[PDB]
């Protein structure tokens with residue numbers, strides 16, 4: 001009925017998962033400490049069985065753009081005010097929910113972070129930062145966050161991007177789109193499968209958006225190597241594109257026409273997913289691009305606030321980029 005797969009916890013199931021995360025928050029010092037990173041995938045085997053069944057099956061389905069879990073309770077009074085910056089965003093009220101996200105993520109794969117993004121944290125924060133309303137990063141607000149493959153520039157980008165909505169009082173929509181296969185002619189499709197496109201790293205990997213891996217980002221922005229936008233099966237391709245940071249190879253007008261066509265087709269097929277408070281989404285970063293609608297920030301303590309995590313099916317595929325730590329890349 002919809003392009004994502006959806007699961008709704010019963011009150012009993014939701015309370016059991018919450019109790020499990022609360023227990024972890026009492027026994028472990030931090031969510032992305034080495035001890036909990038190793039233990040979380042096994043603790044997650046204790047989550048409610050109906051949820052584990054959904055995650056195991058839905059990950060193997062061929063069609064969904066995202067796996068959506070609704071119905072986690074969040075008490076605004078216990079959670080407290082939305083932080084003013086991500087640096088101070090590991091508040092006690094949000095702590096059990098950060099553990100909950102880690103437990104759900106462990107059913108899907110291996111979590112990791114980036115040395116060049118929010119100080120190498122694995123669980124990151126999405127919130128509006130005053131003065132950054134018209135930027136191209138996820139702390140924007142008044143300017144729409146254009147659609148993108150997460151970390152498109154990198155061969156080590158996530159297979160799944162997890163988002164947990166801590167609060168979203170004005171119902172701001174996440175945007176999604178898949179490959180517009182019904183409108184791509186064969187010739188245009190052929191071009192998108194060839195290595196004729198440049199993809200640069202987005203602004204969230206810049207030094208200015210953080211408090212030696214930055215040299216790799218500079219090389220990627222300065223001298224990008226040509227890559228394909230589409231890979232895999234022609235009838236169900238995987239997608240790698242960033243609307244704001246993608247370009248054709250220099251002088252390649254055939255590739256430019258193909259990228260220009262794809263831009264218009266994705267713009268025309270973008271749809272909206274609203275993550276209400278307590279909703280979790282795992283976006284398939286190979287099948288879909290995602291973004292976020294423009295909204296007016298409040299800055300009154302009740303702004304939209306998400307926790308975010310990157311998930312790969314195999315951490316060993318990124319060995320070359322382990323930044324002195326398997327769980328932080330760069």
Ligand SMILES: N=C(N)NCC[C@H](O)[C@H](N)C(=O)O
Pocket residue numbers: 136137138139145146147148150151202203204242243244245
């Ligand atoms: N604005 C564009 N095209 N992409 C940047 C947004 C990304 O999701 C980035 N990892 C961020 O959080 O800002």
Ligand SMILES: [Fe+3]
Pocket residue numbers: 148150290291
């Ligand atoms: Fe994103």
